[PDB]
Design an enzyme around this catalytic site. Structure first.
Site, PDB file in Angstrom:
ATOM      1  N   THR A 190     -15.080  -3.279  10.694  1.00  0.00           N
ATOM      2  CA  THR A 190     -17.085  -4.397  11.186  1.00  0.00           C
ATOM      3  C   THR A 190     -17.971  -4.780  11.629  1.00  0.00           C
ATOM      4  OG1 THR A 190     -15.061  -6.193  10.092  1.00  0.00           O
ATOM      5  CG2 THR A 190     -17.389  -6.563  11.721  1.00  0.00           C
TER       6      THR A 190
ATOM      7  N   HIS B 143      -7.107  -6.395   2.096  1.00  0.00           N
ATOM      8  CA  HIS B 143      -7.337  -6.310   3.169  1.00  0.00           C
ATOM      9  C   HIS B 143      -5.914  -7.761   3.543  1.00  0.00           C
ATOM     10  CE1 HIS B 143      -7.713  -6.432   7.868  1.00  0.00           C
ATOM     11  NE2 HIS B 143      -9.503  -6.619   7.709  1.00  0.00           N
TER      12      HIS B 143
ATOM     13  N   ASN C  58      -4.327  -7.582  10.282  1.00  0.00           N
ATOM     14  CA  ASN C  58      -4.945  -7.835  10.983  1.00  0.00           C
ATOM     15  C   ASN C  58      -5.268  -9.772  11.457  1.00  0.00           C
ATOM     16  OD1 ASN C  58      -5.080  -5.412  12.281  1.00  0.00           O
ATOM     17  ND2 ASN C  58      -7.260  -5.258  11.504  1.00  0.00           N
TER      18      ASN C  58
ATOM     19  N   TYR D 146      -5.907 -12.352   9.154  1.00  0.00           N
ATOM     20  CA  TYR D 146      -7.284 -12.376   8.686  1.00  0.00           C
ATOM     21  C   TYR D 146      -6.040 -12.820   6.287  1.00  0.00           C
ATOM     22  CZ  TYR D 146     -10.294 -11.239  11.550  1.00  0.00           C
ATOM     23  OH  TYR D 146     -11.223 -10.798  12.553  1.00  0.00           O
TER      24      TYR D 146
ATOM     25  N   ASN E 134      -4.879 -12.849  16.549  1.00  0.00           N
ATOM     26  CA  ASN E 134      -4.695 -13.929  16.756  1.00  0.00           C
ATOM     27  C   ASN E 134      -4.007 -14.742  15.309  1.00  0.00           C
ATOM     28  OD1 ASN E 134      -7.727 -14.577  16.396  1.00  0.00           O
ATOM     29  ND2 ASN E 134      -8.912 -13.483  15.172  1.00  0.00           N
TER      30      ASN E 134
HETATM   31  C1  LIG Z   1     -15.688  -2.273  16.129  1.00  0.00           C
HETATM   32  C2  LIG Z   1     -14.341  -2.352  15.277  1.00  0.00           C
HETATM   33  C3  LIG Z   1     -14.173  -3.289  14.279  1.00  0.00           C
HETATM   34  C4  LIG Z   1     -13.200  -3.401  12.841  1.00  0.00           C
HETATM   35  N1  LIG Z   1     -13.635  -3.290  11.872  1.00  0.00           N
HETATM   36  C5  LIG Z   1     -12.139  -4.100  11.201  1.00  0.00           C
HETATM   37  C6  LIG Z   1     -12.481  -4.191   9.873  1.00  0.00           C
HETATM   38  O1  LIG Z   1     -13.122  -4.007   9.105  1.00  0.00           O
HETATM   39  N2  LIG Z   1     -11.052  -4.173   8.814  1.00  0.00           N
HETATM   40  C7  LIG Z   1     -10.156  -3.251   9.334  1.00  0.00           C
HETATM   41  O2  LIG Z   1      -8.511  -3.914   8.914  1.00  0.00           O
HETATM   42  N3  LIG Z   1      -9.856  -3.309  10.976  1.00  0.00           N
HETATM   43  C8  LIG Z   1     -11.752  -3.398  11.200  1.00  0.00           C
HETATM   44  N4  LIG Z   1     -11.259  -2.746  12.815  1.00  0.00           N
HETATM   45  C9  LIG Z   1      -9.682  -1.799  13.261  1.00  0.00           C
HETATM   46  C10 LIG Z   1      -9.720  -0.413  13.119  1.00  0.00           C
HETATM   47  O3  LIG Z   1      -9.750  -0.053  11.179  1.00  0.00           O
HETATM   48  C11 LIG Z   1      -8.891   0.471  13.610  1.00  0.00           C
HETATM   49  O4  LIG Z   1      -8.037  -0.243  12.950  1.00  0.00           O
HETATM   50  C12 LIG Z   1      -8.663   0.512  14.718  1.00  0.00           C
HETATM   51  O5  LIG Z   1      -9.849   0.639  15.482  1.00  0.00           O
HETATM   52  C13 LIG Z   1      -7.992   1.395  15.926  1.00  0.00           C
HETATM   53  O6  LIG Z   1      -7.828   2.646  15.335  1.00  0.00           O
HETATM   54  P1  LIG Z   1      -8.850   4.009  16.008  1.00  0.00           P
HETATM   55  O7  LIG Z   1      -7.493   3.606  17.871  1.00  0.00           O
HETATM   56  O8  LIG Z   1      -9.332   4.992  15.734  1.00  0.00           O
HETATM   57  O9  LIG Z   1     -10.308   3.152  16.335  1.00  0.00           O
HETATM   58  C14 LIG Z   1     -11.936  -2.216  13.866  1.00  0.00           C
HETATM   59  C15 LIG Z   1     -11.967  -2.156  15.008  1.00  0.00           C
HETATM   60  C16 LIG Z   1     -13.382  -1.515  16.014  1.00  0.00           C
HETATM   61  C17 LIG Z   1     -13.114  -1.049  16.874  1.00  0.00           C
END
Ligand SMILES: Cc1cc2nc3c(=O)[nH]c(=O)nc-3n(C[C@H](O)[C@H](O)[C@H](O)COP(=O)(O)O)c2cc1C
Ligand SMILES: CCCCCCCCCCCCCCCCCC
Length: 354
Positions: free
Chosen positions: A34, A181, A184, A186, A241
């Site tokens: 996001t 989704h 997390n 939701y 959450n």
């Molecule tokens: C800025 C940001 C936005 C995220 N938005 C989403 C999202 O839209 N959907 C989702 O399922 N996870 C979202 N996540 C989680 C990521 O998909 C991912 O699981 C998490 O960043 C861990 O992976 P990484 O260590 O490679 O960053 C978001 C994470 C970050 C940091």
């Protein structure tokens, strides 16, 4: 062990056949992220087109979470895929990714109790049960979370309808598929956990009932677009959450074999640091899922290319989603391929869409 990394991550560049419809050119996924950069109509912008297009060396991009209808919105400027204008905006994104030799799935979102009525004209926030989360919307001025309305079964039918219609729109927008989704904290995850799901009807109270909404959404989407174009993100471990409950494990013990029957494109874990062990799951989230689900699994969460390569070599999961490093390094794949230095992510990078 994953920590005993080696001097080659060649396996990340293996071709990976998801199914008879889709083969990925490598095992590296862009995790859904996001960014809060869509326009006032929640239409993807031309800056978002460029942002995704420059990451098309990924085997598969998972888009940012994309809302299925207005009462799904919980954060500013999160794109939708329920209007014609939104479909057209996404078609620019998917055309650009495809023209660059990439593939892309949309992530379909409803925030449930994490929605905020500021974004949708003061409407009702919907959830399995009238259980409010703590606090207020991040990075916004004083938008306190509200007690949701417990959905009726008619509300549920309309939500399933709207997930399915969104999936149809996704195909019109030229995506290769949908990641649902279910993670997390939701809406779908809210049905799967006892903190949020206190229902006593056919959607609560037993593993079969608590899994019902997720499976109805999966099945409705499969009926619209096909199993080879449908993946699902899940969070068996509570962490965002969502309060934990020792009874949640048996919900997932039921759900995972049911999901296997649908022969999905993939199941994807939703976690931030998969090195964390969860008491209730007997270890890490990915190892729990791998012990209960026998088809393609996407790991994620604080992996380097080296630790992901090692995990995949050790049969812990099949594909690696990379999140924060893809924000810090648009050219992540090329830098990994060429053994070049990567920039560490910092939250300050979110201010910029590059
Ligand atoms: C800025 C940001 C936005 C995220 N938005 C989403 C999202 O839209 N959907 C989702 O399922 N996870 C979202 N996540 C989680 C990521 O998909 C991912 O699981 C998490 O960043 C861990 O992976 P990484 O260590 O490679 O960053 C978001 C994470 C970050 C940091
Ligand atoms: C909305 C995406 C970006 C979120 C940044 C803030 C972090 C949310 C995820 C928190 C990860 C740590 C979770 C702590 C939970 C305890 C579980 C053992």
């Amino acid at each position: 062990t994953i920590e005993n990394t080696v001097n080659s991550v060649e396996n990340l560049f293996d071709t990976y056949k998801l199914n008879d419809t889709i083969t990925l050119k490598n095992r590296i996924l862009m995790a859904p992220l996001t960014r809060c950069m869509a326009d006032a109509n929640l239409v993807p912008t031309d800056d978002m087109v460029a942002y995704y297009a420059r990451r098309a060396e990924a085997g598969l991009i998972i888009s940012e979470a994309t809302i299925i209808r207005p009462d799904a919105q919980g954060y500013p400027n999160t794109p939708g895929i329920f209007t014609q204008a939104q479909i057209a905006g996404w078609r620019k994104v998917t055309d650009a990714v495809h023209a660059n030799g990439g593939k892309i799935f949309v992530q379909l979102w409803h925030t449930g109790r994490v929605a905020h009525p500021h974004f949708f004209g003061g409407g009702d926030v919907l959830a399995p049960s009238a259980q409010k989360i703590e606090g207020s919307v991040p990075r916004m001025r004083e938008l306190t979370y509200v007690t949701p309305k417990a959905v009726t079964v008619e509300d549920i039918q309309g939500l399933v309808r709207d997930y399915a219609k969104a999936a149809e729109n996704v195909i019109e927008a030229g995506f290769d598929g949908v990641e649902i989704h279910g993670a997390n904290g939701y809406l779908i995850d809210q049905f799967l956990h006892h903190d949020s799901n206190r229902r006593t009807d056919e959607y609560g109270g037993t593993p079969v009932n608590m899994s019902r909404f997720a499976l109805e959404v999966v099945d409705a989407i499969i009926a619209r677009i096909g199993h080879d174009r449908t993946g699902l993100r899940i969070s068996p471990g509570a962490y965002f959450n969502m309060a934990s409950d020792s009874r949640d494990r048996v919900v997932f013990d039921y759900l995972l074999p049911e999901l296997e029957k649908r022969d999905l494109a993939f199941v994807h874990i939703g976690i931030f640091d998969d090195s964390i062990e969860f008491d209730y799951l007997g270890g890490t989230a990915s190892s729990y899922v791998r012990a209960h689900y026998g088809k393609t699994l996407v790991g994620v969460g604080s992996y380097s290319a080296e630790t992901a390569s090692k995990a995949i070599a050790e049969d812990k999961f099949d594909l690696i989603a990379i999140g924060r490093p893809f924000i810090a390094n648009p050219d992540y794949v090329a830098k990994v391929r060429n053994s070049e230095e990567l920039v560490a992510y910092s939250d300050e990078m979110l201010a910029s869409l590059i």
